[PDB]
Design a binder for this molecule. Structure first.
Ligand SMILES: C[S@@+](CC[C@H](N)C(=O)[O-])C[C@H]1O[C@@H](n2cnc3c(N)ncnc32)[C@H](O)[C@@H]1O
Ligand SMILES: Nc1ncnc2c1ncn2[C@@H]1O[C@H](CSCC[C@H](N)C(=O)O)[C@@H](O)[C@H]1O
Lengths: 260, 259
RNA sequence: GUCGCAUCCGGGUUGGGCUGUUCGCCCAUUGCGGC
């Protein structure tokens, strides 16, 4: 089926998926970009509709594997895309079902706990860093939706394969207690420099919201509160930069380095 | 005195500052956000006009220091702002003009050399990381605009006091040579892990745009270092890379040993 | 600020928030111009 008019009803339906409410109502979501579509397919997500733009290449069509295939003009593509410059390959996938029930951790896991994050770019960047550092688990507690377009783009598709689970704040606390994982709260006023923590054992790093930071209750639960030094005018670092810094310090230590 | 119409001639001139062309012509630029205005002031920049919206606080007016204060309606504010939901505190500052010529670094400086043209939002975030880690100097391409709205917003205002200088490549190479600063190229294919470099005596990190480094710079570097990537992702965001590198140097200057 | 015109029930065509701001972002809800 070929579609030209940006006013085609399917195009309005497709463009609607950029909204979290439509994703919840339909159970489906949009994945934009060849790499991102590849990663969703490779992660086992169920493709319902492949969207091909005018400058798509022959191999793109072979990705559909039985899903409906729609050709879109540059005009209709522009409406469906979340990007100033539209990608040429997109996929409508069924939202995945994932629960922490099936998750088992090894002896010394590296875990990230994200509490209240609001900016989808920050979440995507954290997921990219978690991929780089080999994080064993990412718990997203009450933040922006994991399948927001910018999470997919900023994660370069890593959101689909990463062990990342949206959880309620209370379930995060429960799961952390159940797993007996030591909690390390990252907070700018933390009493200990982050380099001075030992992360060779199992560890869960707690990161707070971009505006208000970690709730006092969560800082209290942690065994230790760590800080990343601020030597200039900024009072705080970006949440994703902080997560990366913590993950790589732990990786440094797990790669042979000694705590400070 | 209150300015209520978006069509007021003064609103027209203030909104024109959204264009770099106009900022260069007038020598003025807009800083949106109490936090950012505060940081511009504390950085020593010259406030020419303070813009106050209907919800500004009494203390906001006292920031003016003899600048003209304009009270703007929400409708006039929306025309000047770069945001769907504007700030109540905006400031028209004089564009600072800084040259590298004066700069003298100490014995063990922490320097970041950004090669290529980076997008504004990424640049802003790179400069915040640099501010956080206490970079002694940041060198960017000659045509880099450091007073765009995204650089101010994504830097959390850190760009105003940060020693960042848009310079020609030869000027950059020359400055680094004349300080005898070890150059460390960050590249995914680096021969060494970034933790293995020794940054206790001074370092100039070379980082390309989110892009790649030019080959001449990679070869000239004393060491090419990589950040380990244990999954499918082949690269990290440039701002994250910048932070990882700068905080590693800080780690080593804080008693840490190279891996 | 204000004035048409739509549209919806005369009365509405919204509130808020934001340490990544850009075809900005988030959250409750329930339009298009002119001067
Ligand atoms: C998003 S990366 C793009 C990669 C870039 N084209 C290259 O090959 O260097 C942008 C910048 O981040 C740096 N970078 C990103 N990930 C890195 C890693 N794992 N190791 C070293 N440098 C990295 C590179 O120096 C690069 O200039
Ligand atoms: N310098 C730093 N040290 C440790 N954690 C930091 C940090 N900068 C940012 N973070 C992390 O990023 C999150 C958002 S920063 C929140 C800022 C708030 N003014 C505050 O002071 O808490 C924080 O909750 C923390 O998890």
């Amino acid at each position: 089926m070929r579609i030209e008019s940006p006013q085609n009803p399917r195009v309005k339906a497709l463009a609607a998926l950029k909204e979290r409410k439509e994703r919840e109502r339909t159970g489906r979501f949009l994945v934009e970009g060849r790499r991102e579509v590849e990663r969703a397919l490779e992660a086992g997500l169920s493709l319902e509709t492949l969207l091909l733009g005018p400058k798509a290449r022959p191999e793109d069509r072979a990705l559909a594997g039985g899903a409906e295939v729609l050709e879109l003009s540059e005009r209709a593509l522009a409406r469906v895309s979340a990007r100033e410059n539209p990608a040429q390959v997109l996929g409508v996938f069924r939202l995945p079902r994932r629960s922490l029930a099936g998750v088992t951790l090894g002896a010394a896991p590296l875990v990230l706990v994200l509490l209240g994050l609001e900016k989808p770019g920050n979440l995507g960047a954290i997921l990219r860093a978690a991929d780089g550092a080999g994080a064993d688990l990412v718990l997203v507690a009450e933040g922006v939706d994991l399948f927001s377009p910018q999470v997919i783009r900023n994660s370069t598709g890593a959101v689909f394969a990463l062990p990342v689970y949206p959880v309620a704040e209370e379930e995060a606390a429960r799961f952390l207690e159940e797993q007996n994982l030591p909690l390390v709260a990252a907070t700018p006023e933390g009493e200990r420099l982050y380099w001075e923590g030992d992360y060779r054992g199992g560890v869960a790093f707690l990161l707070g919201a971009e505006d208000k930071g970690l709730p006092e209750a969560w800082k209290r639960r942690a065994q230790v509160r760590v800080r990343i030094p601020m030597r200039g005018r900024a009072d705080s670092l970006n949440v994703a930069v902080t997560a990366a810094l913590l993950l790589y310090e732990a990786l440094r230590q797990r790669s042979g380095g000694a705590p400070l």
